[PDB]
Each structure stands twice: as structure tokens, then as C-alpha cells.
Amino acid sequence: KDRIEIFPSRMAQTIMKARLKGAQTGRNLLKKKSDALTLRFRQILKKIIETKMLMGEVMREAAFSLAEAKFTAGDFSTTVIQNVNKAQVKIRAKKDNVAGVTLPVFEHYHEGTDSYELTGLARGGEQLAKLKRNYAKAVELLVELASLQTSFVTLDEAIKITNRRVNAIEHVIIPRIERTLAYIITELDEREREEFYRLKKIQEKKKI
Amino acid sequence: PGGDFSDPVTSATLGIVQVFWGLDKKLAQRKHFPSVNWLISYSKYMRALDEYYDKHFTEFVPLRTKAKEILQEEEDLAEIVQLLAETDKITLEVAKLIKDDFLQQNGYTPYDRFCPFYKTVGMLSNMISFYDMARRAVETTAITWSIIREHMGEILYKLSSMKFKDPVKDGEAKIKADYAQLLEDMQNAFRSL
Amino acid sequence: PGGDFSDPVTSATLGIVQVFWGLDKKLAQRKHFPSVNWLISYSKYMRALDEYYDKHFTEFVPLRTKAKEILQEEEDLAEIVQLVGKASLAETDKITLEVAKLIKDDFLQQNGYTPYDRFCPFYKTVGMLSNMISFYDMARRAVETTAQSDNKITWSIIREHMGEILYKLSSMKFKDPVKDGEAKIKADYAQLLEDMQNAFRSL
Amino acid sequence: PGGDFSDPVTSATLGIVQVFWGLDKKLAQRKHFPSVNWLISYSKYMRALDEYYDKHFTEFVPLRTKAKEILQEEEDLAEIVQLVGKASLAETDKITLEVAKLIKDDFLQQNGYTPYDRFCPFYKTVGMLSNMISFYDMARRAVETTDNKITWSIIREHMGEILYKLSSMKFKDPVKDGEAKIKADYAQLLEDMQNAFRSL
Amino acid sequence: RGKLIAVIGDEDTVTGFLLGGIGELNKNRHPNFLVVEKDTTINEIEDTFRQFLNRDDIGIILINQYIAEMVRHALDAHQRSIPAVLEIPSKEHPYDAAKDSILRRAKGMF
Secondary structure, three states, rough: OOOOOOOOOHHHHHHHHHHHHHHHHHHHHHHHHHHHHHHHHHHHHHHHHHHHHHHHHHHHHHHHHHHHHHHHHHHHHHHHHHHHOOOEEEEEEEEEEEOOOOEEEEEOOOOOOOOOOOOOOOOOOOHHHHHHHHHHHHHHHHHHHHHHHHHHHHHHHHHHHHHHHHHHHHHHHHHHHHHHHHHHHHHHHHHHHHHHHHHHHHHHHOOO | OOOOOHHHHHHHHHHHOOEEEOOOOOOOOOOOOOOOOOOOOOEEOOOOHHHOOOOOOOHHHHHHHHHHHHHHHHHHHHHHHHOOOHHHHHHHHHHHHHHHHHHOOOOOOOOOOOHHHHHHHHHHHHHHHHHHOOOOOOOOOOOOOOHHHHHHHHHHHHHHHHOOOOOOOHHHHHHHHHHHHHHHHHHHHOOOO | OOOOOOOOHHHHHOOOEEEEOOOOOOHEEEEEEEOOOOOOOOEEEOOOOHHHHHHHHHOHHHHHHHHHHHHHHHHHHHHHHOOOOOOOOHHHHHHHHHHHHHHHHHHHOOOOOOOOOOOOOHHHHHHHHHHHHHHHHHHHHHHHHHHOOOOOHHHHHHHHHHHHHHHHHHHOOEEEOOOOOHHHHHHHHHHHHHHHHHOOOEE | OOOOOOHHHHHHHHHOOOEEOOOOOOHOOOOOOOOOOOOEEEEOOOOHHHHHHHHHOOOHHHHHHHHHHHHHHHHHHHHHHHOOOOOHOOOOHHHHHHHHHHHHHHOOOOOOOOOOOOOOOOOHHHHHHHHHHHHHHHHOOOOOOOOOOOOOOHHHHHHHHHHHHHHHOOOOOOOOOOHHHHHHHHHHHHHHHHHHHHHH | OOOEEEEEHHHHHHHHHOOOOOEEEEOOEOEEEEEEEOOHHHHHHHHHHHHHHOOOOOOEEEHHHHHHOOOHHHHHHHOOOOEEEEEEOOOOOOOOOOHHHHHOOOOOOO
């Protein structure tokens, strides 16, 4: 196992040398790919918290407007939970090839179905439309954050795969090949030496 | 010999002759006589035949340079590929097609007893055009390789079966008309994408 | 010299003898003291001997073949285990790997300088291999029969179920040819086999 | 030949010589005029000269060992920085590679084309080494980092002026400067740092 | 266009989001949400989360932080990207930053 089983010859030297050069080029490329993927990972990390804080303040404002609407119309919660048939917003799953990996990503699609206007309870529609905006902005930002989330997890798994490959080529393949190469060199030198000895012997005998 | 590239005989011959052809590292396909090694294969009559060819054929110069480029291209990539980009794919299967059909003459068969100039011209021209009509970009010009394969499987079989046009039986006009018809088939297939 | 097999002396001897017991330095480095590289070793007296086993130890014949195949399959996986880690293989594969590992650690290993292992009578070896292969096929069939069920038996479950039984199977090698009758050790092997049967059926 | 260290000559020489001063063209690309790759160099006469340095330069002996330790430390620190980045570092780590930066820029690099930096008389070197290590020793067992701590940005905003003087120590010319003058000046820098930790 | 946002929360969140139109009844007349209060149990929450997992038209989950605390093991065990689970905290109570499923993945961070 410690050496690739090949009989020593000059052809063996050339082929092993080519394979060695190839191993270094492949290693170097995979290292570079890993660097780029790490950069994209860190870039995601840099914005997750900013999105989270904007999230927090927006949701706080929106659920405040909900509290005010509850003061206005009283108990519209019961009727709105009562009225659930169709939604006006869906999510579109599209792809991003930031690198050789495929990245899941989402988009905030608006179907456009009619919303359930509520006006019976003391005519609270003035608060209700305010809510329709406050929560809608939040929903948009959610869809964005979720896109970021799925991208993050898939990116993590891919980068770990590439790191596995880099370690595999770095700590296993190269030492085996170079050990083989050294062994071939040694065998060839020994053979040439034996030839030299035989020729010198016959030459010395030629004197008689 | 066993020392394909180090025996003094090949060395001495290499230092004298003007045109040399060699085989590559011995492939598993031991019957693969038409191999070519770009490392030591060369010809020094490229200049002297320019003035002859300028009044017979001038199209083959870019085609030959492209063939050399694409052969070099998979020669460079196959190492990493053993250890992807769409252009890499297009180029790889194009080069394999070239290696399998343009090269790999049996020699002994009714279909390789002799290949005149026009048959080579048609073969390589159609191959390189097929390469060019896809290599340009993801789109038809500035999808994936699999959709190209599933659409043009029949066309690819025709590309491979180009070699079965016997010159001894089929007249030259029929064979070149067939090449042109199949070229139009490729054009129609690519334009529908 | 050099530890390889390129010198003309060795190559000359290979062309004459019929049986070959290669040794590998790393194995003796492991303190796997009887360092025999089964992979490279071979024997050309397999024929003209089957009659003896058919007349005395007929069951040994399939058993050894099974063991050889298991060793080969372990080797055939080990490279891809080494290149790429675990958690990418089916239950059968890891089961075969682990049982092959225990075969390696117990059956192949043999310390002839302890008083109790200076010599191993053949029937002891036959019984040991019989117990091993019986356990192996029982476990493999059990996990296979539950492949499409709602509760797939994994290797961790087998360990939780039979750690102590595996320990006894490992300590199986502690049978002195003297100071311990043939009958009692044979009965011990049979009783262990019955225990393995009971533990499997209980699962 | 081509850097191959398996050449029988290279092995034979490396087995007999005691001191090896490796050189690196990569260092010369940075314009490090004394291009000496410390990470590969070594000296086996350390014990040979310990008596002379005990007799004459008692204080020198501990300093160099700490310096070598700092070099190994900043190597490791650079590794972990390459893994993530300098943000994740603690404050002790920040101080250590900052001292590594300053030693590399002043005590390590040389410019032999200036009258003030073309000959080390070995007592100026002792002084600047002692001052460097005194600063490094201030970083330990004298700050809150060794409850709330003090980040090095605060220490910089406090005495960047004395950091700059420590850096500019290199510009002392022995021919024009009395030996006593330079020792007194470096003592002045030391007691300036003394007032510096007294105030903070 | 493909999938359906789903939300589990107290009355405040579910009301506010159904105002935003997040909500659907399938052909079997089954909601994509669960109103949870003191009367709702942990095992019901986990079962309904698995019911969401069974559906092929979800994509996104919106869990109130109390609910996340209640079924932490189910959330953590489900290391799947197909539900892009997002944590969100409740009205009257502090923001939930610790125990975030992704912040644990990061190490060089707060």
C-alpha cells in the first residue's frame, strides 16, 4: 500500500512525474475553491445579524399596530381566524450558482388574491390597512431571511465536502507517489551501477 | 520497445527525420494503432505546403488549428477530471468524438481501405462546426450539455456513423450531399433550442 | 535484503516451491506477532486434500471459503473507507468491516509464548471459525430481514444488544489444550452458540 | 540542485556544521536586506558562550529565549489568524503579534547603507532588546488582562508616542553618540514607560 | 408560486399574519398553521410540526420562540434545509438571540 505497484523503468519515472504534477495542480485548485467558498460563507454571516435587528424593530412596530387595532375593533381576531380560504402571497424556489455548488434561494411572490377586508366591528379598517402594511413589510423581510438561511446551511455542507477532498489529496496521495518515485530512482541507479561493474570487468580481462 | 521514449534508437531517429509520428503512453486498447502523442509528434513541412494549398483548400487551416487546440484542451483537463463547467463538457465529448471516429481507423475494413481528402475535410469540418455551435456559451451563442445530448442523440449517432460512408461503392457526390444534409439537420436542431 | 521481493534469490525460490507464506514488516510492527500477509500468501495444495476434510471435518470446507471472502471484501472496502470517512455506507458493509476487524484481532492473532497458546489443536480452530461464521451470518440475515421494516436494525443497536456476548466471543481464545478437557471446551463453545441464538431470537 | 536537500553533499555538510544561516529570496522580495529565514536557521553554540554572557551580559541570556518563544508564538498566531482572522484574537494575542510586528520591523530588518544602521556594536543591540522585552513584560503581570480588563486599543491611545519612540530607537549612530549617551537615553525610554504604566 | 408559508404562534402572531394573508386550507380542508396557548400541548406541537414536514407544499416555517423552546429537540434534530425554519420571538417578552440554530454553527461570532 505504501507504494503504487509499478515496475521500475524510465517510462515509470515520466508517468509518475506527470501524475505528481497533476496532484499538485488539483490540490492548488481545490484550495482556491475552498478559499472562495469560505469568503461567501463569511459574507453571509456578516449580514445575518443586521437582518435580524431590522427584523426585531419591524415586528415590534407591527405588533404594536395590532394592539392598537385590538383597542379599536375589539375582537377582530376571532373573525379573521374564522376567514381562511385563500392566500395572496406564495414563495418561488429558484437557484443561485455562486460557485460550482447549487444554492437554494427564495423569492417573495405576490399572487394578488383579494384580502379579507373587515369593517363591521366599529369600522376599524383604518387600523386594519395600517396593519396590512406593517405586517406585509415584515413578511417580505422574512422571505429574505429564509432565503439567507437555506443558502447558509447548504453552503456549509458543500464547503465541508471540499475541505474533505483537500485533506484527502494533501495528506495521502502526494507522499505515496513521491515515495514510489524515490524508489524507482534508487532501482535505476543500482541497475546502471551493475552494468558499469560488468563492463569494467570485461575491459580489465581484455588485457590478456 | 518497453522503453517507448528512452531507447537510443528513437532518440537517434528523432534527431534526423523531418516528419515524425509517435504513439502515446501505451493505452489499454492495445489495438489502438492510430494513437498520436503530441509530445513528440511534429512535421516541418507546414510552410512548404501553404503555397500548394492556397489554391486548392484554404478552409482547413483554422479547422486544423482548432483540432489541435481542442486536443490540447482535453489533454490538459483529463488530469483534473480524473481527480463541472459546461464548456469543459462540450469540449471533452467533442474531443472523444474526434478520437473515436476521425481517428481510430481499423485500416482493414471496406470503410478504411482508403480515405481520400474530401472525406477527411467533410468529417473534420462537420465535427468542428458541431463543437462551435455549442461551445459559444450556455445559450446557443453569447441550457446544459444533457439537454443537448437528449435532443441530438440521433444526430450524434449520425456523426459517429459518418465513417461508414464507403468511397469504393458510394460516389463522392452522394457522400458530400449527405454531409451537407446532416449539417442542415444540426442547424435546425440548434436553432430550435 | 531491503524487505522487498525483487532480489533474484526470492524470485528464483518462488518458481520452485508450491506454498508461500509472505510476511509483512508492518504487521510484526503492530505486535500482530504471527505476521502473515494473507493477501499475498497462497498455496497450491488445496486439491488432493478435500478428501481428508470430507472424511473428518466436512463443515470446515465452506467455512474457510466464507472467511476468505470476508477478508477480501474487507480489504476491498478499506481503501474507500480510508479515502472518505464513514457515514456513507450501508449497514451490511459496516457489519462486515467490524466482524472482519474482530477476526483480525482474535483469530489471526496468536501469541505462542503464553503458556495457554503455545499450540492450538485443529478442532479448536474449527470450532472457533464455526462460532464466528455462525454469528456473522445470523447477524447479517437478521439485519437484512428488517431492511424494509419500520425499525431498521443498525450496528449501534447490535452493540447495545450484544456487547457482552462479543466480549465473550473475543475471550473465546482462552482455552488451554491441557488442564481443560476437550469435552468441556467443546461444550463451552456449544453453550456460547446457544446463547447467541437466544439473544438473536429475543431481538 | 533545485533546492534538493537529498544531495549527498548537502546531507554531509548539514551533519557536521554547527551553525546554519539560511537565506530566502522570498524575504528579499519584501526588501528585507538581511534576508535570513529564522524559521529554518539555528545555532548549536548556545551553551558554548553562556559563560561569556554570564560574565559580561547577565541580562542578555533570558531575553533571547523569550524572543525565540515569541517567534514561535507568532507563527502559531499567524496560523490561527489565517484560519479565521485577527478579529477572533484575545488581547494577549493582539499584544504578542504587535510586538512581533515591531521586532520584525526594527530589530530584525537592517539597512546597511545608513551611518546609523550599518554596524551593530552589540551594546546598542542589548539595549534595544532589553527595552523590547521590558515592554513585553509590561504586557504581562502588570495589566488587568493578567473583572473588566483593558483592551490594547486603550493602551495605544494612551502611549502611541512612546511606542513610536521605541520604534525610532533604531536611529542611534554610535560614531556620533557616546556609549554613555545611548545607554542613558534608553534608560530614559525605560523610565518613560515607567511613568507610562504609573499613569495607567 | 410553489409552496405555502406556515406559522405556529400565539393568538397575536397568527392573527397578525392571517391579516397579512399567510394562510391556506388544502383540498382536505386542513390549515397550514396552529394556534397554540396554555391549553395546547407540547406533543401536539411536535406532531403538527411533523405533519407540516409531511406536506410537500410548505417551504418556510414561522415558530414563536416559546414554541421553539417547547420542542427544542425536534427542531435541532431536524437538520434539514427544505424547511427553512426561522425563529421569531413573541410580543410581550425579550428578543430571542441565544439558542439560535445557526448561531451555534458559527464560532467566531458573538
